[PDB]
Design a protein around this ligand. Structure first.
Ligand SMILES: COc1ccc(CC[C@@H](NC(=O)[C@@H]2CCCCN2C(=O)[C@H](c2cc(OC)c(OC)c(OC)c2)C2CCCCC2)c2cccc(OCC(=O)O)c2)cc1OC
Length: 128
């Protein structure tokens, strides 16, 4: 499935090159620009625990998914990953626990040492 493709073909976009965040572009976006730290970003996404039993999607939201990039409003994997995206791009992102919830987890929703998988579409981004 999609996660297996990311493991075997994904790009390691981590600074440490530890394979903690692996990416595949599924749909190429527009232009060349990718967001800067402090930019407000607008996304649609869906996500899951790698090993089963919990699934999330922005399509269930009343309002669009918005956050300021690089400001620790989301897990590390997203601050790293969404920063690499172009407007319109859709990517798959596989996120090891060190870039997500760690050994602590976020119980009872997210267990200890969970790997997460996301499909992310960057709708737009704007300056601060
Ligand atoms: C800097 O570190 C952190 C910053 C934020 C958090 C909180 C969870 C933080 N979650 C996340 O960063 C990641 C990436 C962005 C989408 C949501 N997300 C999640 O892990 C997903 C998530 C979705 C959640 O609600 C939609 C959620 O809130 C209950 C949540 O809490 C742990 C986690 C999970 C759900 C189960 C399947 C796997 C994905 C969060 C949730 C909801 C919104 C949000 O930002 C936008 C906003 O507030 O409107 C930030 C944890 C953090 O570290 C543990």
């Amino acid at each position: 499935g999609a996660p297996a493709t990311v493991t075997e073909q994904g790009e390691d976009i981590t600074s440490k090159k530890d394979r903690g965040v692996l990416k595949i572009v599924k749909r190429v976006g527009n232009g060349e620009e990718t967001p800067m730290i402090g930019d407000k970003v607008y996304v649609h996404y869906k996500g899951k625990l790698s090993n089963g039993k919990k699934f999330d999607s922005s399509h269930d939201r009343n309002e669009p998914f918005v956050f300021s990039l690089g400001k620790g409003q989301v897990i590390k994997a997203w601050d790293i990953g969404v920063a690499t995206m172009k407007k319109g791009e859709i990517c798959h992102l596989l996120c090891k626990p060190e870039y997500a919830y760690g050994s602590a987890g976020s119980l009872p929703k997210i267990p200890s040492n969970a790997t997460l998988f996301f499909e992310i579409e960057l709708l737009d981004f704007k300056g601060e």
